[PDB]
Design a protein around this ligand. Sequence first.
Ligand SMILES: Cc1nc2ccccc2c(-c2ccc3c4c(ccnc24)CCO3)c1[C@H](OC(C)(C)C)C(=O)O
Ligand SMILES: Cc1nc2ccccc2c(-c2ccc3c4c(ccnc24)CCO3)c1[C@H](OC(C)(C)C)C(=O)O
Lengths: 146, 146
Amino acid sequence: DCSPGIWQLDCTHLEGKVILVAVHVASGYIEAEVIPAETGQETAYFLLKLAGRWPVKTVHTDNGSNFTSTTVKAACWWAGIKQEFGIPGVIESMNKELKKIIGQVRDQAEHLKTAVQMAVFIHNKKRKGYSAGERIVDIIATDIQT
Amino acid sequence: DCSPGIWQLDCTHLEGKVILVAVHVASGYIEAEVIPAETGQETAYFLLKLAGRWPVKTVHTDNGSNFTSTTVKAACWWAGIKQEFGIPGVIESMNKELKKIIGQVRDQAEHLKTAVQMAVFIHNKKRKGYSAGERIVDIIATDIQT
Ligand SMILES: Cc1nc2ccccc2c(-c2ccc3c4c(ccnc24)CCO3)c1[C@H](OC(C)(C)C)C(=O)O
Ligand SMILES: Cc1nc2ccccc2c(-c2ccc3c4c(ccnc24)CCO3)c1[C@H](OC(C)(C)C)C(=O)O
């Protein structure tokens, strides 16, 4: 999607832990956190953080049941977020890409969470020809003036 | 400072917990996390996250001993961050402002960390006449083209 307020949120499992990954659909920019286990409360907390940093309008997921909890609904209500009911998705390979980079760097760090943030850094800085990190700020900045 | 790669990191204490606050000096934009206690490892981890998201060149603090740990030095080395040896600071009132907003919203949430992220959201979205959230993306976007 071209729309700059659209994010996708999904969890992946690795080493008995959970990685919550948010992808800015228009740019391919990622933010991630390692959490103990998938819970509504953790998703809610993550969304509050994301919304305070970026202009989040709509969120999508590959697992709709992710957003059924009261806590998630509360966070979306307060921050003014809707569920995205478009996207009938390059975000699959985006997540597998991340899991690849994590694999490449994993032995360099003790903790998974360290490897994850290393992988997010690599992903967001990598040039394509701008990086995801540059594309997100450009898209959002532009949209402010539009 | 006008320089867009400059951040200030400090911890504040509230309810027996620690709030790590990063301020983008040029814009006044904030990111924050609640941690159990001040440790080098938590500061290091926080820096890795910050660096993966923004083009962080130099970091300053009001407590220099914050950055003596091996873990912090490792994170700064890997992410290519230097200590800022300028700034001989509106960032004091910036932190007290945040603690004020937290006070205003605190009773609305069970957890301190929820109130903190609520306060970060409010701070970053508030118009001055742009918000901190808009100023950071503008400053960074502009600097990409310069
Ligand atoms: C524990 C809880 N339990 C809950 C139980 C039911 C519904 C919401 C929560 C909420 C809640 C969720 C999202 C919000 C809230 C806000 C104010 C108060 N509570 C919440 C504004 C920002 O978004 C919460 C909050 O905790 C988490 C964010 C970790 C889930 C809270 O600290 O009150
Ligand atoms: C536990 C530790 N213990 C340490 C002890 C001494 C020095 C560094 C650490 C480091 C370390 C710190 C920063 C880094 C690292 C990198 C690779 C490997 N280790 C680290 C690249 C990114 O920045 C770390 C890392 O853990 C924290 C980030 C929670 C401190 C790690 O998981 O290896």
